[PDB]
Amino acid sequence: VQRIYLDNNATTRIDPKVKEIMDPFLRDHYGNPSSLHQFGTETHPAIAEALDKLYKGINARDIDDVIITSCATESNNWVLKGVYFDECLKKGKNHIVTTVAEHPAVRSTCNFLESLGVEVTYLPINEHGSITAEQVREAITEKTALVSVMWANNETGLIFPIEEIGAICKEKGVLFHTDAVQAIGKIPVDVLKANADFLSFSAHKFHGPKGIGGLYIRSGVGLTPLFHGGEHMNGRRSGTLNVPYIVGMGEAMKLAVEHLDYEKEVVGKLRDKLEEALLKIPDVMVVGDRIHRVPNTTLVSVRGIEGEAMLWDLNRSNIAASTGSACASAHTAIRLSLSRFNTEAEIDKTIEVFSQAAVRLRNISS
Amino acid sequence: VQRIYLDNNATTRIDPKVKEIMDPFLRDHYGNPSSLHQFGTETHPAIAEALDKLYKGINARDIDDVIITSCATESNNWVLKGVYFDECLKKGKNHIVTTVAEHPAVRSTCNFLESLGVEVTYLPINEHGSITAEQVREAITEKTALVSVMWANNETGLIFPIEEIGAICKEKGVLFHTDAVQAIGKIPVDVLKANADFLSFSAHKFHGPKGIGGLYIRSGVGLTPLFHGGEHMNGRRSGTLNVPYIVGMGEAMKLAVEHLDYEKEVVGKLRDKLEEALLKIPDVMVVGDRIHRVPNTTLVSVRGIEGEAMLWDLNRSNIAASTGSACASAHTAIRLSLSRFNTEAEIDKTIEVFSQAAVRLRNISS
Numbered sequence: 048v049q050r051i052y053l054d055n056n057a058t059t060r061i062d063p064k065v066k067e068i069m070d071p072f073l074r075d076h077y078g079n080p081s082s083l084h085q086f087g088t089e090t091h092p093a094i095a096e097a098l099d100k101l102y103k104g105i106n107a108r109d110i111d112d113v114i115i116t117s118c119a120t121e122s123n124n125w126v127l128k129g130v131y132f133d134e135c136l137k138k139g140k141n142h143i144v145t146t147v148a149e150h151p152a153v154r155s156t157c158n159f160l161e162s163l164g165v166e167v168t169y170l171p172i173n174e175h176g177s178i179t180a181e182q183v184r185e186a187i188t189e190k191t192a193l194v195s196v197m198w199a200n201n202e203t204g205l206i207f208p209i210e211e212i213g214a215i216c217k218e219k220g221v222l223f224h225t226d227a228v229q230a231i232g233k234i235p236v237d238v239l240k241a242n243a244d245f246l247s248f249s250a251h252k253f254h255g256p257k258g259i260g261g262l263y264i265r266s267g268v269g270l271t272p273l274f275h276g277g278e279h280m281n282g283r284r285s286g287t288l289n290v291p292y293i294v295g296m297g298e299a300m301k302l303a304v305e306h307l308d309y310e311k312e313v314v315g316k317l318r319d320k321l322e323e324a325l326l327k328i329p330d331v332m333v334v335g336d337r338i339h340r341v342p343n344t345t346l347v348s349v350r351g352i353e354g355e356a357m358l359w360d361l362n363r364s365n366i367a368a369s370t371g372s373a374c375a376s377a378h379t380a381i382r383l384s385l386s387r388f389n390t391e392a393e394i395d396k397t398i399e400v401f402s403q404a405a406v407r408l409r410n411i412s413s
Numbered sequence: 414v415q416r417i418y419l420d421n422n423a424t425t426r427i428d429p430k431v432k433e434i435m436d437p438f439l440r441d442h443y444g445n446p447s448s449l450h451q452f453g454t455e456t457h458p459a460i461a462e463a464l465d466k467l468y469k470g471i472n473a474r475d476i477d478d479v480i481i482t483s484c485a486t487e488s489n490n491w492v493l494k495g496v497y498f499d500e501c502l503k504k505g506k507n508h509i510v511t512t513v514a515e516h517p518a519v520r521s522t523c524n525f526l527e528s529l530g531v532e533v534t535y536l537p538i539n540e541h542g543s544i545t546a547e548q549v550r551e552a553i554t555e556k557t558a559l560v561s562v563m564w565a566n567n568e569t570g571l572i573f574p575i576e577e578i579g580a581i582c583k584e585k586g587v588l589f590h591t592d593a594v595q596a597i598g599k600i601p602v603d604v605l606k607a608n609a610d611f612l613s614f615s616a617h618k619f620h621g622p623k624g625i626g627g628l629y630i631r632s633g634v635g636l637t638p639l640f641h642g643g644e645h646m647n648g649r650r651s652g653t654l655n656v657p658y659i660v661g662m663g664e665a666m667k668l669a670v671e672h673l674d675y676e677k678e679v680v681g682k683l684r685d686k687l688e689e690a691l692l693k694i695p696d697v698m699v700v701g702d703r704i705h706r707v708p709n710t711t712l713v714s715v716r717g718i719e720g721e722a723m724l725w726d727l728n729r730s731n732i733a734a735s736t737g738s739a740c741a742s743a744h745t746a747i748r749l750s751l752s753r754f755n756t757e758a759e760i761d762k763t764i765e766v767f768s769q770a771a772v773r774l775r776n777i778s779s
């Protein structure tokens with residue numbers, strides 16, 4: 048059996064170099080880095096190289112922190128609730144502005160904060176598919192504690208006017224956070240260009256293991272810890288370090304940025320090949336803008352066929368893709384998200400199987 | 414080089430069967446369980462067997478939840494802060510009772526809760542080395558939201574009068590939580606005998622990977638989530654599942670309980686061998702009770718030699734142990750904590766190296 052994985056915005060395959068670099072810390076070098084003997088200290092070099100790969104991966108400065116978390120969801124919860132106790136409760140700024148397209152890790156936590164009496168403006172999405180950057184400008188009152196905007200959307204792949212919103216947040220003097228999970232590995236990420244005080248990212252989206260993530264914190268920005276115990280990570284996130292996953296996530300970061308040119312020149316080209324081959328068929332239109340998109344994702348709608356149906360028939364031919372709410376009723380569309388491991392042959396066969404399914408389910412609808 | 418690891422209360426070695434069972438989910442079966450295609454569903458059986466190994470490992474019922482967390486520190490933070498928003502803020506019960514020997518993951522979070530205006534009684538430790546169970550009885554006011562007591566101490570190995578305290582907490586109708594990290598693998602753990610509403614445990618203490626843990630929640634007990642997003646784990650802890658670490662932690666639980674008789678009949682006997690061989694030398698006395706201790710840990714003090722000194726000289730001979738504050742100034746003592754992989758030969762050589770060091774540093778003190 049030869050199956051084709053086109054759902055890399057749900058999770059990615061661990062790169063062999065990553066599993067490679069992780070194995071020894073699951074095998075013989077199992078010491079706790081917080082220990083003082085050679086079993087602990089023995090682990091510090093590889094840890095430092097990992098963190099340096101991260102700093103250099105997002106262009107963070109040695110003055111800043113790149114705290115290692117359990118996942119991007121922990122990073123988002125820690126940002127929202129931390130700036131809640133920090134600014135909303137203890138500085139009055141009882142307002143947070145974000146988008147309606149944020150991951151449930153953001154939207155749901157902001158919903159909890161509304162439950163705590165916080166006023167939140169969820170910025171409406173336009174027809175182009177992204178935020179204007181001026182929506183936040185007209186949105187920032189004088190009691191906004193934070194602006195949170197994802198770097199790129201997980202369903203549509205649409206990049207957002209970050210860097211611009213970073214400049215606006217610097218101007219009005221307000222905290223800036225970006226869920227950058229779908230940006231790492233796809234497009235370059237610069238915390239300094241973005242004027243971001245907080246940045247989130249999850250490892251299993253650039254071919255690292257699930258269950259580890261990272262939160263970037265600019266120098267001087269305070270964030271009341273989500274994990275108390277105050278021993279690890281300058282006290283900001285307690286708990287024994289996931290040494291293996293840390294190392295492998297450093298290597299996953301490195302390999303991810305070393306394939307950026309490959310991601311746009313090759314992976315994006317296969318995206319254009321598949322997508323363009325797919326809209327040559329009756330009633331199918333891509334959801335959202337096509338120009339400012341991450342190279343690897345396309346989200347297309349189909350005739351009078353729900354997304355889950357094409358997911359089922361595609362699954363029966365061993366091709367994996369997700370759904371994605373689209374335009375209006377929702378109706379659910381197909382999200383196909385490539386990676387650096389897919390080939391053109393897989394793409395041709397995905398167009399074959401796709402068209403066969405389209406006329407199959409489309410004909411059976413009568 | 415042959416080095417001897419006697420710091421299993423800091424972390425343990427991943428059992429080969431665990432790395433074995435984990436490998437495929439780092440290799441070919443990398444799908445996100447939240448996905449609907451065969452890559453996601455393909456992972457559900459091994460996940461279910463893992464969770465069943467956990468439930469059966471702590472004698473939890475199918476009605477209860479055993480939520481998978483990032484570590485025991487996340488579990489403790491989630492318990493304290495969750496019952497804070499649940500009971501202290503929204504039921505007035507602005508009081509929490511715990512011990513002074515709790516892990517910093519507990520004590521530090523309770524310190525944060527005091528910062529939020531919560532009254533906390535940190536129960537004093539006695540000369541026997543444990544809590545009375547009646548200390549909580551005389552401590553439970555009518556506005557206590559929760560009692561938190563570790564099952565066994567990480568520095569001394571002393572088991573605590575759990576089950577008794579569980580009965581007291583059932584009587585006065587108050588929430589009961591136990592940090593059971595040092596109990597798993599060492600002694601049997603029964604949530605039903607303990608009348609515990611919340612139980613914490615970390616995986617890397619029974620030969621699983623660092624960076625995954627578990628929190629047991631009795632049926633009907635509400636706990637406002639620390640991770641919002643509400644997709645995973647009945648919504649109580651969002652974030653993509655650490656499929657590999659979940660599987661391996663299930664197997665680590667299983668193998669841990671299948672070696673309980675070996676842990677007491679063999680590992681405890683090697684503990685008694687080393688410890689008894691060690692107090693035959695001048696001014697050294699074990700810290701705390703010797704009867705009700707986990708089979709694997711001993712904490713001994715030495716003459717006029719700080720603990721860190723013996724740690725250094727032992728490290729130079731490639732033997733790993735930790736410290737542990739003891740009695741009075743502190744002075745710091747030696748914590749040696751065994752595992753199921755140590756042999757008698759290692760113990761004899763640890764007594765040799767130990768005595769040589771004792772007279773070495775002891776003589777140089779003049």
Ligand SMILES: Cc1ncc(COP(=O)(O)O)c(CN[C@@H](C)C(=O)O)c1O
Nearest residue numbers: 286287422423484485486516567594615
């Ligand atoms: C009782 C107890 N609870 C919780 C923890 C922390 O577990 P995590 O790192 O997975 O959150 C520990 C670690 N102890 C080690 C640090 C020691 O005592 O040396 C512990 O002994």
Ligand SMILES: Cc1ncc(COP(=O)(O)O)c(CN[C@@H](C)C(=O)O)c1O
Nearest residue numbers: 056057118119120150201228249652653
């Ligand atoms: C932008 C973004 N942030 C955060 C997350 C969650 O990451 P963790 O599970 O490591 O916390 C995701 C996952 N997306 C997947 C679920 C999807 O869109 O299908 C995401 O796309």
Ligand SMILES: [Cl-]
Nearest residue numbers: 128129272273
């Ligand atoms: Cl918090």
Ligand SMILES: [Cl-]
Nearest residue numbers: 494495638639
């Ligand atoms: Cl909370």
